[PDB]
Design an enzyme around this catalytic site. Structure first.
Site, PDB file in Angstrom:
ATOM      1  N   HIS A  62       0.832  -1.233   0.000  1.00 40.91           N
ATOM      2  CA  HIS A  62       0.000   0.000   0.000  1.00 40.91           C
ATOM      3  C   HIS A  62       0.863   1.279   0.000  1.00 40.91           C
ATOM      4  CE1 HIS A  62      -2.307  -2.920   2.790  1.00 40.91           C
ATOM      5  NE2 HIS A  62      -2.624  -3.218   1.541  1.00 40.91           N
ATOM      6  N   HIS A  92       2.492   9.381   5.850  1.00 44.30           N
ATOM      7  CA  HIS A  92       2.714   8.556   4.659  1.00 44.30           C
ATOM      8  C   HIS A  92       2.360   9.382   3.439  1.00 44.30           C
ATOM      9  CE1 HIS A  92      -1.610   7.983   5.614  1.00 44.30           C
ATOM     10  NE2 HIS A  92      -1.780   8.110   4.313  1.00 44.30           N
ATOM     11  N   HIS A  94       1.018   9.227  -0.928  1.00 47.99           N
ATOM     12  CA  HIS A  94       0.244   8.564  -1.959  1.00 47.99           C
ATOM     13  C   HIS A  94       0.889   9.246  -3.181  1.00 47.99           C
ATOM     14  CE1 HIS A  94      -3.124   7.301   0.881  1.00 47.99           C
ATOM     15  NE2 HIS A  94      -2.768   8.367   1.578  1.00 47.99           N
ATOM     16  N   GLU A 104      -4.601  12.457  -3.933  1.00 43.59           N
ATOM     17  CA  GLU A 104      -5.941  11.936  -3.698  1.00 43.59           C
ATOM     18  C   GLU A 104      -6.960  13.081  -3.882  1.00 43.59           C
ATOM     19  OE1 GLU A 104      -5.502   9.350   0.103  1.00 43.59           O
ATOM     20  OE2 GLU A 104      -5.941   7.998  -1.551  1.00 43.59           O
ATOM     21  N   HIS A 117       0.113  12.783   4.037  1.00 45.85           N
ATOM     22  CA  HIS A 117      -0.918  12.735   5.062  1.00 45.85           C
ATOM     23  C   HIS A 117      -0.293  12.564   6.417  1.00 45.85           C
ATOM     24  CE1 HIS A 117      -3.967  11.047   2.005  1.00 45.85           C
ATOM     25  NE2 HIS A 117      -3.870  12.379   1.918  1.00 45.85           N
ATOM     26  N   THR A 196      -8.919   7.129   3.543  1.00 48.01           N
ATOM     27  CA  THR A 196      -8.973   6.855   2.111  1.00 48.01           C
ATOM     28  C   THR A 196      -8.624   5.401   1.705  1.00 48.01           C
ATOM     29  OG1 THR A 196      -6.747   7.720   1.608  1.00 48.01           O
ATOM     30  CG2 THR A 196      -8.574   9.283   1.644  1.00 48.01           C
ATOM     31  N   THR A 197      -8.349   4.547   2.691  1.00 49.09           N
ATOM     32  CA  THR A 197      -8.057   3.137   2.426  1.00 49.09           C
ATOM     33  C   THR A 197      -8.925   2.351   3.402  1.00 49.09           C
ATOM     34  OG1 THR A 197      -6.237   3.090   4.041  1.00 49.09           O
ATOM     35  CG2 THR A 197      -5.665   3.580   1.786  1.00 49.09           C
TER      36      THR A 197
HETATM   37  N1  LIG Z   1      -4.717   7.835   3.697  1.00 46.07           N
HETATM   38  S1  LIG Z   1      -5.348   8.209   5.113  1.00 46.07           S
HETATM   39  O1  LIG Z   1      -4.674   9.337   5.843  1.00 46.07           O
HETATM   40  O2  LIG Z   1      -6.771   8.450   5.179  1.00 46.07           O
HETATM   41  C1  LIG Z   1      -5.199   6.955   6.398  1.00 46.07           C
HETATM   42  C2  LIG Z   1      -4.861   7.230   7.750  1.00 46.07           C
HETATM   43  C3  LIG Z   1      -4.764   6.210   8.711  1.00 46.07           C
HETATM   44  C4  LIG Z   1      -5.005   4.900   8.344  1.00 46.07           C
HETATM   45  C5  LIG Z   1      -4.922   3.768   9.357  1.00 46.07           C
HETATM   46  O3  LIG Z   1      -4.636   4.017  10.515  1.00 46.07           O
HETATM   47  N2  LIG Z   1      -5.178   2.464   8.957  1.00 46.07           N
HETATM   48  C6  LIG Z   1      -5.158   1.252   9.767  1.00 46.07           C
HETATM   49  C7  LIG Z   1      -6.408   0.874  10.376  1.00 46.07           C
HETATM   50  C8  LIG Z   1      -6.695  -0.492  10.752  1.00 46.07           C
HETATM   51  C9  LIG Z   1      -7.985  -0.793  11.369  1.00 46.07           C
HETATM   52  C10 LIG Z   1      -8.942   0.277  11.591  1.00 46.07           C
HETATM   53  C11 LIG Z   1      -8.652   1.619  11.218  1.00 46.07           C
HETATM   54  C12 LIG Z   1      -7.391   1.902  10.617  1.00 46.07           C
HETATM   55  C13 LIG Z   1      -5.339   4.598   7.008  1.00 46.07           C
HETATM   56  C14 LIG Z   1      -5.447   5.585   6.002  1.00 46.07           C
HETATM   57 ZN   LIG Z   2      -3.154   8.686   3.377  1.00 43.48          ZN
END
Ligand SMILES: NS(=O)(=O)c1ccc(C(=O)NCc2ccccc2)cc1
Ligand SMILES: [Zn+2]
Ligand SMILES: [Hg+2]
Length: 258
Positions: A62, A92, A94, A104, A117, A196-197
């Site tokens: 990712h 991180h 993108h 994004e 981000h 966003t993921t």
């Molecule tokens: N691109 S973005 O800034 O929006 C983004 C920020 C944080 C997370 C994250 O903490 N994921 C793990 C996770 C696992 C389980 C529940 C929630 C998050 C993912 C995307």
């Molecule tokens: Zn992000």
């Protein structure tokens, strides 16, 4: 099997396992400047990153995350549209396979080369796990990157990428200063959105900076040499790890400037 950015498990497939993808407050969105409402009651943003403690950098498939010690109020975000103190937990990027795509959020349909981000969670919730169960649990600071001159503060990140080329690999990454990645101005747009993921939880207050930072061609090129795959598996270059813009629905994008 698990989600990804490929033709068979990309964004257009996420809804099958994550129903929330078609929800009311999904991110990212397109920022139409002629429609954002100037809101004078928005306070200035307060970013306090003087006591930040970076710990590790890792490739989780990712993208690559730089993790900070959030056991105490070390690097916080307050002000702006926020109510309370938010702790920095990680940052991180993108990015794209070409310079004309990778971000994004888009501005007037304009895509940038990449987007940074900086992820923070609301301290009144105790831990990040509780925070993702609340409508105001997270605050993500988004910064656009355009290809131009080199950004000194980013080079320390670029240099360590070789050691974390494949999925699951990490490297110790202490003493990094995130202040080196901020633009000059702190003017921003803001709206309620989501991660966003997957799991795509709608628990984020998005703060997108108006001014982008410049990064050199060579700096971005090194991002593109990372791998989605783990050691031993067939090589898949980590590029275009971004989700397309989602419909705004009943939301309003407020601006702290005019
Ligand atoms: N691109 S973005 O800034 O929006 C983004 C920020 C944080 C997370 C994250 O903490 N994921 C793990 C996770 C696992 C389980 C529940 C929630 C998050 C993912 C995307
Ligand atoms: Zn992000
Ligand atoms: Hg939530």
């Amino acid at each position: 099997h698990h989600w990804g950015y490929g033709k068979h498990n990309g964004p257009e497939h996420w809804h099958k396992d994550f129903p929330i993808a078609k929800g009311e407050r999904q991110s990212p969105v397109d920022i139409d400047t002629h429609t954002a409402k100037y809101d004078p009651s928005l306070k200035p943003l307060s970013v306090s990153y003087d006591q930040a403690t970076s710990l590790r950098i890792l490739n989780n498939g990712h993208a690559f995350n730089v993790e900070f010690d959030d056991s105490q109020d070390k690097a916080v975000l307050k002000g702006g549209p926020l109510d309370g103190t938010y702790r920095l937990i990680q940052f991180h990027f993108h990015w794209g396979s070409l310079d004309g795509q990778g971000s994004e959020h888009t501005v007037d349909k304009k895509k940038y080369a990449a987007e940074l981000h900086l992820v923070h969670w609301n301290t009144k919730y105790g831990d990040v796990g509780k925070a993702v169960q609340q409508p105001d649990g997270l605050a993500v600071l988004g910064i656009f990157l355009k290809v131009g001159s080199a950004k000194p503060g980013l080079q320390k990140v670029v240099d360590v990428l070789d050691s974390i080329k494949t999925k699951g690999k990490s490297a110790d990454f202490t003493n990094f200063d995130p202040r080196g990645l901020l633009p000059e101005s702190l003017d921003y747009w803001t709206y309620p959105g989501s991660l966003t993921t997957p799991p795509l939880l709608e628990c984020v207050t998005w703060i997108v900076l108006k001014e982008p930072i410049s990064v050199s061609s060579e700096q971005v090129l090194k991002f593109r040499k990372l791998n989605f795959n783990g050691e031993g598996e067939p090589e898949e270059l980590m590029v275009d790890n971004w989700r397309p813009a989602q419909p705004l629905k009943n939301r309003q994008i407020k601006a702290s400037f005019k």
